[PDB]
Amino acid sequence: MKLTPKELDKLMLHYAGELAKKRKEKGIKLNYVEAVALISAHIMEEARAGKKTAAELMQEGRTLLKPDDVMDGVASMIHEVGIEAMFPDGTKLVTVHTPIEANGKLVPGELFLKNEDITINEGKKAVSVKVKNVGDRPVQIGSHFHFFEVNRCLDFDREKTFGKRLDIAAGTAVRFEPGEEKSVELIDIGGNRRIFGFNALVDRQADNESKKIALHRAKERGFHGAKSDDNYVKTIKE
Amino acid sequence: MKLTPKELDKLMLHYAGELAKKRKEKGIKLNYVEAVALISAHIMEEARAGKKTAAELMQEGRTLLKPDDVMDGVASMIHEVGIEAMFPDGTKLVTVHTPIEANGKLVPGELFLKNEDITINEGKKAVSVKVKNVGDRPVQIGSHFHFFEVNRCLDFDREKTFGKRLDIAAGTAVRFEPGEEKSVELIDIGGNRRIFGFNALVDRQADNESKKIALHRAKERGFHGAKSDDNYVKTIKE
Amino acid sequence: MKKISRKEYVSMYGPTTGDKVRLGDTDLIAEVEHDYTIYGEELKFGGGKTLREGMSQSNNPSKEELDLIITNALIVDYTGIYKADIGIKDGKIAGIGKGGNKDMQDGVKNNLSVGPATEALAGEGLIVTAGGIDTHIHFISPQQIPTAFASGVTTMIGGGTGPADGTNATTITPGRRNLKWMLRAAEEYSMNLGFLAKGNASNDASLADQIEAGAIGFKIHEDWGTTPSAINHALDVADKYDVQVAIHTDTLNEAGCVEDTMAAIAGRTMHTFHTEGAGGGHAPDIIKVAGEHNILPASTNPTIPFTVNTEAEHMDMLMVCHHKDKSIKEDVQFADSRIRPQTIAAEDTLHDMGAFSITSSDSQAMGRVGEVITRTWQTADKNKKEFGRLKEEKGDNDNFRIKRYLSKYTINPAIAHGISEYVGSVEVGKVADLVLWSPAFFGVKPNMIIKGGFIALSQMGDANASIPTPQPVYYREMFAHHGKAKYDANITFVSQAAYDKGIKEELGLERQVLPVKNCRNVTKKDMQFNNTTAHIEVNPETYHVFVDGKEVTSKPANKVSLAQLFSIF
Amino acid sequence: GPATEALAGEGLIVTAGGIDTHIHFISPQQIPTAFASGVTTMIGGGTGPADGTNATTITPGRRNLKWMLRAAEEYSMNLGFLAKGNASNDASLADQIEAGAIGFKIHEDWGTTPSAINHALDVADKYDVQVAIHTDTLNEAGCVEDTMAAIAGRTMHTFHTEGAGGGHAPDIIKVAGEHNILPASTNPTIPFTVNTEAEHMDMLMVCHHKDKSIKEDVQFADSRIRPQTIAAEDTLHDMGAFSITSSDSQAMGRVGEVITRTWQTADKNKKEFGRLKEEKGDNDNFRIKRYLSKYTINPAIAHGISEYVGSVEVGKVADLVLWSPAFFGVKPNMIIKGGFIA
Amino acid sequence: MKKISRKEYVSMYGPTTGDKVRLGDTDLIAEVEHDYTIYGEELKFGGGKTLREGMSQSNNPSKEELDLIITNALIVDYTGIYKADIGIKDGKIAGIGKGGNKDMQDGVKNNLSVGPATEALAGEGLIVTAGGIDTHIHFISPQQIPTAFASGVTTMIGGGTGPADGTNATTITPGRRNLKWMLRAAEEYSMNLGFLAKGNASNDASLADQIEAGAIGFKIHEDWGTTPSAINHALDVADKYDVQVAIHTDTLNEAGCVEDTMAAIAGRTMHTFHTEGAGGGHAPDIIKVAGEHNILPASTNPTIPFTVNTEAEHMDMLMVCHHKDKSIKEDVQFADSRIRPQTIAAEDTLHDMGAFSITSSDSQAMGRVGEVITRTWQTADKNKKEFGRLKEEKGDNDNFRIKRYLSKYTINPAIAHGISEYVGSVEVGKVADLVLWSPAFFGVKPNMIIKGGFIALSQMGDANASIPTPQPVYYREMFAHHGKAKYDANITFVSQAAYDKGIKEELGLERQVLPVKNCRNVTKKDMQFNNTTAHIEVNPETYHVFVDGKEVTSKPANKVSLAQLFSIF
Ligand code: NI
Ligand code: NI
Ligand code: NI
Ligand code: NI
Ligand code: NI
Ligand code: NI
């Protein structure tokens, strides 16, 4: 019966679920491991039966255990239980979000933040810019992307955003639906202000002179808002 | 409890059988894996009980599942289920031949041959030979064995079968019960007709001259039918 | 010259010319196109069979004597579907034809001679194919290997450093040091390996160093920033080192749209992963790229085939990932601008059309490294059930279509990464990575995996039993998987540059080490049975897919073959 | 001294490691199985789950010998390989030895003919290496009388001399009485249980491709699985007629029960024939040594490795297995390989 | 896709499928069986032709790039007669097919890719065949080499030490010292070489030592005493060292008759020189041997073809030799018991029947090392003119018969002496010993001889002229004939034993040195298009030849082709 190593993985999980249930049967507050295995073993069988759809099990899994069935802490712990099973249409990923509820105090590793607000990008005075997505597709820019070089679709005053980035929490971004128009905040880039990569519009020291070159480049490359060519005076290298 | 690695193998198989059954319980068309494990887990316990004999379980295993319990295709698949278990007399190999039946269409990898007959050994005109086993033990010759050198017991016209083999499907053979007498078909050996090995009667190019030497040799070696020594004229090497 | 019936003959030597085999529980029927044997002289091993001293086995073999013969095997390969013996010598496929003993049988080339040094492997009734080659692997966990292996895959190409976020997101092994770790780690496994480096850099020096370090190519990925700069720079260095480049398109369209990305590629060769879009890439018209000449289209495992559950499933993965919320609109937008059920269904059909060429996995990151083969055949099954046989099909079979899909995970990935000369198809001169399939289980569960001319993995039973058949019967490591044998049987790929710099001796690598080549002169036209080019558009509003004017789409499915029938999970 | 480690043995019984000389290198998983059973040395042939190997204990040609020797590095078990003696080609015959083989193996499926037999033996004499053999069941080349004439009185290790494991039908078992023969029995038909006859017919049928409706097929089955020669075995061992106990792993043999079965048989024979004439005192010591030797010192000698292993004696490699008297012969306490706990 | 006429097309690319060529001034008509090119994309070199930068010649070649392409050549080989490009790389024939630039042309395997490193050789209108292989050479004078060479022969196998009587009588290089002299002398020439040792010894030790010393085989000859002892001993040692044995039968029948000689051979392999009898051998029924299975029949140059002058000529050679007188009866008897006009004429026909297999020369000793090829074709011409076309012939051509004779001096001698793997036919993987023939002069005077992948000899004109065509136009040594180049281009054959003992480094041999193999497992059935066996008798009284009951004989001829038409002498 050529059992794959994946199959053995599941066969083991199942008896971890079986144990899990048999314990609840005897009436015993399940724990992190037991709760998860149980939820997992369950979904597994249901997919075997070929009845419940993937979409349905996502939920039905949230009714396998009630707050009084588990130990305090378990709820705050099992944020979610992902699991794969073979449906008549093949294996599919079922994610049972928050299966049980926090009917108790104890919360492992809980955080005790201190109400107050972190002030991001200290002293980097932002600037607002009118931006509109003239294209027919979406466009989302990251927090540290040289704004001046985003999709050539976003129309706006390129000239004004040279050497700047979206003044937002590191790692996040701003979305622009086709047609949408908004005003974004953008501070200047820190460090050595050495802009290399992106759209290849700068690739050097970001200064007022490099700027001239950047606009000229964007201009010829079709980046909406890229000012204009009021007669360029090409340097010895660019 | 010094568990051998073999033991763990079985302990795993068992819970594969247990799952198999528990699923059938819930009323679900078992599959290839499930059917096999189930049949396996079963036989295993029975041997443990020390009641049913090896011979009996071979059959009883054919009644663990009915054509409507499994998925279509499973039958045509499980040709047989071999399994070893420890009987009071030690471990024994139980082979449950065709446990379930083909109550359906679907047949994985099924073959669609094309009624017609393959003609073997094209253009190799056979010849019939009277053969009798004068010995008190059985003698079975293979399809590509230089016939002229078979068991010295089989009596027949050795002279006539030099450089020939049983004109039959490659890999098969002809049996001769002690006393039995039959006429066999035998075509000439192909390729370079280089006969080396067997009974050491030839070990060279198979031609009319080597033949003389072969018969002379068989003669002295006692191979029934090996013509006679009408005064041999030994060559410079033989 | 007495004759015998076809039913009989086939239970001794397996199907012959004109006969047909059903592939697994699918509707795909294959037909034996030719037979090199010579009815009456076929090879058989056994008690009183043909492979014995002085008989089939020669006592005067040729000085090329085989180390192993797979008798009467049905070879399914893009080169054809036929009957013939396979000869194996020195880890390489030494011959494909009759073979036996010239001393006692007509027509037997000396590259197929059977002597006392050759081993026997029965193949009658079985189908032999080359090992599979997954080229979109995330080296997230080493446990993937024995999984992909058990599934008929002998070669994994990808990137990473283990369960690190960078790896979970991208198939990249960054920098020469991390390349070292992985190459040295690879010594341990039973699977040819190749690694991709971080192409997400506009620094030429850093770009070539990773190749000089051992990488077979670059990988540009979104999470690392797939910009037209990075793209452009990477490609140039890729051209110099004749190595391949894979890419994950800029979904957020932040740098530009698929139009720009192409302009970036400047017409140079490229391996596009999950070209469809679900696996990632330009929203929502990335799938259009798979129609251009210079592109090597590849689809990612998950959205294949298109099942009634695939749409729901994905939305979940995409949400469980990326950190998306149901209450946030920008979050629901991105989800809908990426998981287009339209472009998904349009995929299954694109494969059938030869538009798409390679089938990957995308292991541990929106991909199932154990179901690439299984799913490639499921899809083929669907498309037949929905579109019927093929126009190109000749005769009452599916041979052509069959080769179409096979090529998708064998010869096509092999070429796309310059390792076609050594592996990727059942042909003389290539490394002997062969997998024997038992017709019923075809495409799902294989009988045994032979790595580098020696058995590395096979179905095995009770190690205590009196035979290998009794249960339990799972996949057990064979001899080519242990000791120093693994080293002779496996290959870690590298670039010419590194190979030439002595990267092997450099890292104390005991594995056979070959370099990749001919990666810069290949196009969509080099993809076997998947060379169809075309100007394909994609509706910005309805996310609908149009090709050459018309529009393509497939209907989801409620059931697929090669599934619940064979596995207990 | 301060450099010596201590291992408590009081209450325990120490014996040498077992040596199975009829192994089919079908699957590497056999090793840890045979090991757990008190066996530290496996001698046989093969290249993995390949039909040739499943049928015979042979690792053919120097290349395949290479693969296996290099593979062996991985395991915890002394190893030795046998080459294909089924060849009448002297050159091919010695090359496999020069390549690493400890001996040859002539097997039916490869064609155990008087030619092959004769040639193999000669080269075996030159290289002072051993030869194992599986007799020509079908008697196609000749009968057991001929096979012997072939052997010409030279040394030979006869596997499953009884017959069930294969060999001349039906009088092969007679060979085990000749001077030049090294009789060995195969695991399966040992001991003789009410189920052994039924079991075998099945293995022989599941194998060879035999049918119930075909008479020639039922004949072969009955001309090979003689319940008579089977039962005659258990007693032959007790008589000292048979000498070695093998397994024949993954091919009509259980590589994990050689020791267990060797003792079961000894137990039976005592229960049915009683104590022994040679026995001295109120014990079974003599008989005990009789069986022990069957899977230790006798297989060791039969394959020229008696000097290093095969018995608890000074100067030899320290392959010792500690047995807890209750579990003796079934489940051992610990296996020490080469002087260290493995 | 405009189209063009056949007359035109053929003056640009040469004959295509179905077209026919007359071979020289003979009646043998060959027909192009297949064409690998792709009408419209064929390769042409010239002023404004196709082989140029970016076009046929790639700017992105494959990493297999050829060193030389012979365009549109008509390949005549035992494997077939067809149209195709020949690719040459590293002294070996790297590919036979389309070839060109994949960048601009469909269907072009990478083993046929044309890049800036490949040279161009026009072959349209010309016929390409493998080099010839004369295996019955007497190393009497080194001047023979450039003669045999000019005639299309690239490989000479034989024996000797120069103009010494032993050599003039036999093709033997006796003892390891004399083997040394010759191997070291061979470095100087442009022709692959192999030497035979003195098999006329019943001393096993002396027998193997000559092989260990470098000999590719033994030669038993009358003048040295071809006895059943010598014969038997030689053969045994020959079996061990997998090397070949040639033989010259005991004419005087002193030890025994042809029946005995055979019993001596004990069925083992043997290369029989001048099996007919004129060149020497058992009187008068030696020719019968050429019908046995274990025999490798070869005919000697002189009595071929059978002309009205051949009988008179021979009697003279046999008399000028041996010291025979007209007044002495025993002397006239021997002459008549050896120069049977009956067995001579029976020869021409035996060749036509496939009974005979190899055509030698027997240089400087009843053989003309410069006319082996010429005479092989003359004979074929006669037999057609007298017996007509062949039964096996398929279509309105002589293709089959053509291959019959070609094989006689290419693939058949190559196999008979274990060097078939490297040379002996126009096939991929073999050493590139090719000779270009201009259809009119076919079989007589060739255009150019390429040794080991490089041009070694060609027709050349006034070295001062403004072109290579103006007279005088004789055969001039080319570059592969000089400096250290000759060493790379030539091969001296040896046994495995010597090769393994380092015979190369041993003797400071700067030539490529290969060993012969597979000489003991070949029979008359290994001779391409000349595998006919048969029980042939020979009348003791009339010296008449009978085969399978009937009798064979040919009629002499008053005129032959490929003669006075082409040479001023
Ligand atoms: Ni991706
Ligand atoms: Ni990925
Ligand atoms: Ni056996
Ligand atoms: Ni055995
Ligand atoms: Ni001569
Ligand atoms: Ni001569």
Side-chain angles (χ1 to χ4, degrees), chain B residues 3-236:
Chain B
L3 255 37
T4 68
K6 176 275 287 58
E7 297 184 73
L8 289 314
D9 253 331
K10 306 308 198 177
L11 186 71
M12 176 280 301
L13 179 58
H14 170 70
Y15 284 101
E18 239 279 306
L19 205 197
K21 60 155 289 200
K22 288 186 291 177
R23 272 179 182 170
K24 164 174 172 292
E25 194 172 313
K26 281 190 174 63
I28 181 181
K29 325 287 298 309
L30 302 178
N31 53 27
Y32 176 71
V33 180
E34 300 165 333
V36 172
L38 196 162
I39 295 180
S40 304
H42 184 276
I43 315 292
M44 299 211 84
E45 299 310 329
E46 235 57 21
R48 175 66 188 91
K51 294 296 185 295
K52 289 71 153 46
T53 78
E56 309 166 11
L57 293 174
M58 261 192 66
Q59 294 304 309
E60 188 184 313
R62 300 185 57 179
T63 63
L64 309 170
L65 296 170
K66 59 183 184 188
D68 329 79
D69 292 347
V70 315
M71 294 169 76
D72 190 45
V74 177
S76 71
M77 281 169 60
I78 301 178
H79 281 57
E80 73 177 58
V81 183
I83 173 58
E84 283 189 354
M86 187 173 276
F87 293 89
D89 49 327
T91 57
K92 300 300 172 193
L93 171 66
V94 174
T95 300
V96 187
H97 308 274
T98 57
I100 65 178
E101 293 194 297
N103 186 189
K105 294 173 70 71
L106 193 53
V107 282
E110 68 165 293
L111 307 68
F112 305 78
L113 285 33
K114 48 170 290 190
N115 64 311
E116 258 165 59
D117 297 342
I118 312 300
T119 175
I120 290 177
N121 299 138
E122 191 88 35
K124 288 308 182 66
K125 55 295 175 183
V127 291
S128 293
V129 196
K130 291 236 299 175
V131 183
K132 183 183 174 183
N133 191 178
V134 186
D136 53 83
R137 289 147 304 191
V139 180
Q140 177 170 161
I141 325 306
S143 66
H144 288 60
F145 190 124
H146 189 198
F147 212 80
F148 176 103
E149 302 175 64
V150 302
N151 206 311
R152 61 194 181 93
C153 279
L154 309 191
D155 180 39
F156 62 85
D157 209 352
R158 281 308 203 314
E159 135 65 42
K160 267 61 185 176
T161 60
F162 183 75
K164 292 166 172 291
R165 68 183 184 76
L166 300 166
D167 180 29
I168 63 183
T172 65
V174 170
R175 190 185 187 75
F176 283 98
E177 286 303 61
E180 165 163 48
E181 188 181 14
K182 294 180 292 188
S183 180
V184 303
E185 295 273 282
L186 50 91
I187 52 182
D188 300 65
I189 302 169
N192 291 174
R193 296 177 66 72
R194 290 284 202 177
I195 313 187
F196 297 75
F198 307 115
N199 252 306
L201 296 184
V202 195
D203 292 330
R204 64 173 84 186
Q205 184 58 60
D207 62 39
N208 278 321
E209 306 306 310
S210 58
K211 194 179 184 178
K212 301 181 180 175
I213 302 182
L215 290 171
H216 183 68
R217 291 177 174 174
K219 180 75 163 41
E220 300 171 287
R221 287 150 105 331
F223 287 69
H224 287 61
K227 213 84 301 303
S228 297
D229 275 313
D230 297 65
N231 310 313
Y232 193 72
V233 189
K234 285 175 174 58
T235 50
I236 198 167

Side-chain angles (χ1 to χ4, degrees), chain A residues 132-159:
Chain A
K132 183 183 174 183
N133 191 178
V134 186
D136 53 83
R137 289 147 304 191
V139 180
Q140 177 170 161
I141 325 306
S143 66
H144 288 60
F145 190 124
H146 189 198
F147 212 80
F148 176 103
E149 302 175 64
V150 302
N151 206 311
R152 61 194 181 93
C153 279
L154 309 191
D155 180 39
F156 62 85
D157 209 352
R158 281 308 203 314
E159 135 65 42

Side-chain angles (χ1 to χ4, degrees), chain E residues 31 41 47 70 79 103 106 132 211 249 265 335 347 366 373 426 431 435 491 513 521 559:
Chain E
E31 195 194 312
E41 291 293 7
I70 305 171
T79 55
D103 267 358
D106 327 287
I211 302 182
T249 25
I265 295 176
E347 195 173 27
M366 278 194 73
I373 306 183
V426 192
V431 302
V435 35
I491 307 165
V513 179
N521 67 12
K559 193 192 191 72

Side-chain angles (χ1 to χ4, degrees), chain A residues 88-114:
Chain A
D89 49 327
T91 57
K92 300 300 172 193
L93 171 66
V94 174
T95 300
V96 187
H97 308 274
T98 57
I100 65 178
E101 293 194 297
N103 186 189
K105 294 173 70 71
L106 193 53
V107 282
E110 68 165 293
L111 307 68
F112 305 78
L113 285 33
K114 48 170 290 190

Side-chain angles (χ1 to χ4, degrees), chain E residues 521-532:
Chain E
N521 67 12
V522 303
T523 60
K524 179 61 157 303
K525 244 279 68 188
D526 277 289
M527 302 285 85
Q528 300 312 96
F529 303 75
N530 295 276
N531 49 3
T532 69

